[PDB]
């Protein structure tokens with residue numbers, strides 16, 4: 223529900239981890255990647271691309287199946303409901319992307335599959351309009367890009383390349399075969415963990 227989100231916004235730290243030391247802020251990046259890494263362990267994703275935007279926004283693009291689009295879409299459901307369809311200083315593990323959505327001033331969702339492109343925009347967890355096809359494609363994959371809420375995150379508010387590179391590096395190693403790339407639009411630094 224709408225309340226479901228209210229609860230998250232009310233006590234973010236309980237779900238995401240500490241909101242003042244940079245922990246929660248970077249964990250917002252990790253949950254999304256973990257979702258992509260799961261699509262890879264499933265056998266459908268081969269490459270993951272993680273980009274830091276100079277507007278202090280982070281995007282994660284994958285070439286997996288694309289969250290099912292058909293009918294509210296199931297994708298909308300994954301983005302707005304707590305442990306959708308199931309059950310559950312670092313906050314929660316596998317908290318779900320709905321929690322990253324709720325704690326985001328803005329989140330943009332882009333999905334490709336079945337020859338189409340679908341997009342939807344949310345604000346503080348709320349869809350600003352329905353999910354719609356915007357064009358045609360031959361590729362498949364999910365792209366999530368979000369802008370953390372400044373009413374939730376204090377003190378350490380800007381993403382830091384070093385923190386992500388250490389973890390993405392660990393993730394590729396522990397998940398042999400998965401290719402993850404990291405790019406810093408702020409300075410042109412890029413990394414490829416294989």
Ligand SMILES: CO[C@@H]1[C@@H](OC(N)=O)[C@@H](O)[C@H](Oc2ccc3c(O)c(NC(=O)c4ccc(O)c(CC=C(C)C)c4)c(=O)oc3c2C)OC1(C)C
Pocket residue numbers: 256257258260261284286287288289290296297300319364
């Ligand atoms: C964040 O969404 C994640 C996905 O994340 C990424 N990055 O792909 C991924 O981690 C995993 O993705 C799944 C997990 C299960 C199915 C899955 O069972 C599919 N097969 C279907 O036949 C199907 C077709 C229509 C439909 O409404 C549903 C149920 C919807 C679900 C499970 C989200 C499933 C499918 O097409 O894609 C799937 C996908 C893409 O689970 C989600 C949806 C929570």
